[PDB]
Amino acid sequence: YQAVQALYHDPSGKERASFWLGELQRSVEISDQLLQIRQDSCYFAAQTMKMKIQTSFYELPTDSHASLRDSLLTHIQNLKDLSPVIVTQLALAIADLALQMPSWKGCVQTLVEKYSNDVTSLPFLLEILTVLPEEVHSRSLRIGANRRTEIIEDLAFYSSTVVSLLMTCVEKAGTDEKMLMKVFRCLGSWFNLGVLDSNFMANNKLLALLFEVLQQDKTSSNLHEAASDCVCSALYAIENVETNLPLAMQLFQGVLTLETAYHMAVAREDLDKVLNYCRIFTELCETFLEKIVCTPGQGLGDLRTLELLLICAGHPQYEVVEISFNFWYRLGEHLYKTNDEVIHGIFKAYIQRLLHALARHCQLEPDHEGVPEETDDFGEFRMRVSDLVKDLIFLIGSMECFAQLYSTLKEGNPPWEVTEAVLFIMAAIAKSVDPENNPTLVEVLEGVVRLPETVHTAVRYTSIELVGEMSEVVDRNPQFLDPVLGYLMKGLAEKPLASAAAKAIHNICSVCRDHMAQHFNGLLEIARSLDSFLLSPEAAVGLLKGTALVLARLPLDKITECLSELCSVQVMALKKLLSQEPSSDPTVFLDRLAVIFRHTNPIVENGQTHPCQKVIQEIWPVLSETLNKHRADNRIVERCCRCLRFAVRCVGKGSAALLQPLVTQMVNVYHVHQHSCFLYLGSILVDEYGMEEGCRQGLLDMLQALCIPTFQLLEQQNGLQNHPDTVDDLFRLATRFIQRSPVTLLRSQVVIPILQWAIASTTLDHRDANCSVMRFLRDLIHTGVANDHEEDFELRKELIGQVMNQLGQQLVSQLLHTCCFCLPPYTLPDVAEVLWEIMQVDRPTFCRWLENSLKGLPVTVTHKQLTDFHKQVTSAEECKQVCWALRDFTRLF
Template sequence: MAEIQSLLSALDVFSRAPDKTSLDSANNWLQEFQHSPEAWSTCNVLLLSPDAPPAAKQFAAQTFRMKVTYDLHQVDEANLLSLRDTLVTAIEHYHSGPRTILIQLCLAVSGLALQLPAWRNPVETLIEKLGKNPVTVPALLHFLTVLPEELTTNTKIPVTDDEYRERAQTILTANAKTVLDLLSMYIQASGVTSAIQAQIFNCLRSWLVAGEISAQEMAATPLLGYAFEALASDELFDAAVDVICDLIHETQEIEDNMPVIEVIVPRVIALRPKLQEVKDDVDKVKGYARIFTEAGETYRLLVLQHTETFFPIVEAIGECSAYPDLDVVPITFHFWMRLAQSIGKKPTVSPLFLDAYKTLMVVIIRHLHFPTDMETLVGQDADDFRSFRHIMGDTLKDCCYVLGTETCLMTAYDMIVNVLARGPSGASWQEIEAPLFSMRSMGAEVDPTDKKAVPKIMDLIPTLPDHPRIRYAALLIISRYTEWINAHPEYIQFQLQYISAGFEAADAEVNAAAGQALKYLCQDCRRHLVDFLPQLHTFLSSVGAKLSQEDKMQVYEAIAYVISAMPMEQAAQSLRTFSMDILAKVHAIVSKGSPATKQELQDVCNGLENLEVMLHVVQSFGEELPPSCQNTCHEAWTIFDAFLAEYQADYEVCERATRVLRHGMHFFGSAVLPIAPSVLARMSTAFERTGLPSYIWIAGKLINRFGNEENPELRNAFRDTYERSTTKVVSLLQLKAPQDMPDVMEDYLRLLLQMIDYTPDLFFQSSAFPLAFRIAMAALTMIHSDIIFASLDLFRMMLTHDCLDPPAVPPPKFPIYAAAIRAVVEKEGLQLVGYLLSGLVGDFPEDSTSVVVTIFRVLTTLWPTQMLSWLPQVLQQLPTSAAPHQVKTQFLADVTGCINSKQPDRVKYAMLALHRASRRARDRRRMGPLDS
């Protein structure tokens, strides 16, 4: 009774509005209770007690399901049949609900049946117990529905593959005909209700999908006919649609199922008039659309081979595609795609299919129309419609695949010409914009050598009305057709004029489209645009101030593509021109003698972002810099150094400046070497003063680039950066938890990884090493995959370093490295082992297991005595919810055995066993004690 009272108290917490502490406490208690052997008897009492509250009964049923899955080993074999009888009796007791309890009990019995060979025929038992009384038939149908689903999908049930195959054959396959006959009898029974008929269909689906009942077997019963007849019933419509779709899907082995297909197809075709009858009921149309498209996809080859017979299905799908509600239309898209792929492989195409795709194209373009009243399209609806237009665009590509791109483009072109012919008063912008959008979608299929359709489109663009949505669509056509323009450079001058006008439009979306068009034009036509670069520079000088930063970035990116196509010296001169324009503004802000305003700083940061974009595109000129670039590296750093000295604490300045430095480092290559110590000194100072991690990010990049250099000044700078950044991170950790500064932790760890890789003498011999070790351990407490991997990689590199297993004649500094590592491990090993095991059974990423095992194996090999003293303390602290007591005990015994037998390599198996056990506990924990 005390156990029951504690359980009821814990459950009661969830019925109130609890604080998080109470909720977590109750949740943990319930999870621990579910693990316990006592839960079996306690839940049995609660389940059958008339006075127990509903939440307790629900919890008891759910606990039975979980314990059957995870804890059946707790029940003596002699009591298993008694447990079966208890659960079957409970199903009978709850035959009328609540449904959530009944389903959990059915799942529990299903899981038990799979693990209990002594129960010879579970299906027969339940039919005998529940199938003869109309009152309990719904409970039987629930059980028969969940049985195949649970047996085929619950991979947590602990049976071997051979055991599973044998039991599935006994429970499911051997009883398939019995179940089919039972369902056939029930569907025709006098007084059968719609609710029971819906259950019958759901049960039938479950056995069909599991592959236990074949389409041919179902077709030999009245169930097939009843399924189609049930479409006339509002109550049964959804269940009937589901079972018909599953039936059709199960006939995809066409040759084996032709007799059934010959029964199904006429019935499906006969449904086509229903589309008109139910046209005002979206849900009904959606159901019929699912049936037609399932038939179309499944019988696609028959549609192609026997077009006259099967084409009514294609026509019905076409009707569904033309339906005005856009929830229905996408149901058909996969069919059109698969059919187009099949048609594309045939030497000749029936005119029926060509007409179908021509109609489909017109239908899709009509669906592309924005509403006449744009105010009706706001918020999420507007976003959804725009996203859906792109999905419809993919179907237009299918039309191109069948009809040819030229035909499709000319159809859209003719639509626009016909609208324009009506004059300004007779044309709506929607009628022009939709075909334009379709041209953009079909652009990916355009042949760069096309001489018929695309020239007409290009000539049409300047004649279009000056409406923002039309200009936006036209600009995006240009951005999509740039490969064609590259093959027809005579159009470039016009394109630049049209794009320039787009930048001057009042509409921000038009500006953005102009930026995108210019970027792709310059990217694909860069060689033709070299002579236009002065024009682009003038354009930037005159219009640049009016552009948004995002648009301006696109222009700089476009210019960079043109520069990348130039001869090297000319490219260097051009890049210098644009770069110095930006750096001059940086220099001006430092030299002005008074603090910069917020807007001035923002303008400079925007300029640096533009420079970053250009450097990203140009990449580099190689190790041999052109004469124009010889002194630029030093000049640029002088400007940056002064700028950061003044404004290093501004976050935006830090981000923008360091990103440019990163690209500059790649661009200038070895030319950076003379200034690298100065850069490192500035980065160290800036990080000390601000704690902004991008400064040590750049330091790590410099070590990666120049770590092999023997320059004494540079190596002193590396050591200085390492020690100063370590001191700063230690001070930050005294104020904040690691999880509150993930960027700092990650960039610091990256710095350490570069140090140990390139400068191990500096890394191990520094007084910063023990501190760095502790910081890396603190990183293991974070729930952040990249940081965990970085930290684990660092520990792996330290503990598997060659100095700990040196060759016969070791390098001179190896003993010093080894002494440093041994000293810190002997001091911090207990805590390190604790973090490793806690993460392994907790929140470490799944892919990190092999690294953890490697680190643990090395610790066991090199520090066996210490490990034997560390492990009991560590295991005691691991939560039992992640590692149950018996699992910890077994792990300790396994590792102790490996150490005592001097077989440390076998530690791997103990670690993997612990990990598997913790995953099972976690899976169970994720379900939660109150999940159904």
């Protein structure tokens, strides 16, 4: 289309070009209508010709087969200088058709005979011979197991002809790179599919050329990578080392030659080639791992493999070393099984050399003048190293290396960056040394709390991180709790060290939560002055969370006054903000109270006065008033709902004193501002109190009182689409009733209008609201099931019956309609679940309903199709069949 002017070259023009794409995608000789006259659109044409001719494979007649070949052969010859990447699209398009043994049925010899000796057939002949055995059994086109049976064994027979063609390609102007890039990609394919299948490459030109090009310093990155990838392809083609006579030996000696070329590329700092070599080296080791482990230093298990990966892992550019990582993990996972102590022992001298190199790579530049950024590119590299150091130390003994690491700290005046790297490594393997008998853990702990403030920020920061891991050793040795907390207070008071210190205190609080009644006051003073320290959000939340969990473990006598002293700091701020007349934002104070109430959950026996009740009753008015002040703001009201949710949970079984005041205020605020978070909070109240018979009536009055304002808001123009949140949270609340007290809802006048609105909301194209409505329908109908006659099921069976008499037909009808006409396929497993549940309550009633639905459905679709679909659903013996039936049926509209 001419109006594509903006597309290639502000969205306001390109938005126009884009619209006509989606119109045309679905449509169908008709694409090749361009080039009425050929003059320099052709990108969009060629790009379209790929995807459409691909789809056309399984659409077109067998009439005009060679037309596709000859049109494509013509086009590709005429479009040689557009782009190297368009050639690939066209080559693939040809090859996935040409492979299919109809048409001219032309097996390998045919392309060879028709094209080979034409000097400019080779660029494209190679391109199609490369992709053809690569897209046998392979993606975008469907796998084609039908055709596969014959072909690979003919390509195994003909591979010699393709190798001989490739030898013609190197004599005929193997002078410059683009031809060899094609030759290597082609050879890599016929390697990859194994189809050489014989000993012969010792008597061949191509394999020597491949390695020569890789040894050259004057070679291009393009050619170097295409050759590197060819060598990897050739290594992967060693499916098993001995399944045919070992061309493996040729590839193995070949790669080992590249060490000189490697060392020279690193001296030149030719990094893209250094990376290409480290890949080849790693894929050699991967390809022969089994031989290395089972026959160490023997034949193709030769340990020069690991020795090359050890020189790579020493390269100062960290991007080089982390190539070799997955091989080290894989070597480790093999050693972790076999348990031959020599097949541990030999390799332990290599694993220690790797672990030394990795530890050296963890050293910061001595330059540095801060803490480590954990989001640096070095910071994130450090994590990958850290996680690999963990695994290989676990094969060696975490005691043995934690021992030797600490030895390095306390000898020969270690510079700061060595000291910090050691503390970093030690923090990775702490939490993996045995705590049942290792007093050396106490040495490091003691020796760290006695480290002076004068050492560089990094050494202090990381020793604070290590002190966190060592929280497990603190719990067993609480004489250290006091010194440890002291060391962490001191770090907490320096901005970059503050967050790391907070993490470690939180670790101490969590791990030692039982043994910290004496230390709660220290935490409480920090918690009081939380904002003075300049912590991250996570760090401040972790510090409160910790104080509250320790508070929950105090003696019941102390909690009331300790809880109020935690909260007061936040309660005062809120009281001041009520006296602030608009603009205020209570969010940060509500969210701190929420963390406190979430985690202050003491264990109280029955009849015992729960110690939070007094604090929550004193606080409730300031939160109640905050909610009413900000009642118009949806966000602040959600921050209130979440604070008040945990405040009532904080009071244990004594919730009853607060539940009616909360439910009242929820109804009052919702009645004026229909924020869906009140429906969601109501759903939490129903879920957690609905099984108590005293709460059931109050909660049903709450549902009835939340429904009137809800329905009025959905009745409005575009009310479903405008309030998908409200639909989601309405059916959440109704489903919690069905789970916790179905009979209470089912006796009520409100279940019928909830089910009427469910049927209407089936039409709303919103994935989470849809998911919520369909769950309500499924769960409501499931309360008509009674697979245990010994249950007191009879009354609910009765009341679901009454409800389904008058709305079961309207339900099945709308469900089928919304599948066919309203909503995309994402609904179908959920509708299938609802239909399946209706059948599992009453199959013959369901049969009638689906029947009268199919009759009511709005000529294209045939009465036979309707009746076949009914048959398919009503006789499915599993829910998944209903899904398939309904999907296939849905495609007809």
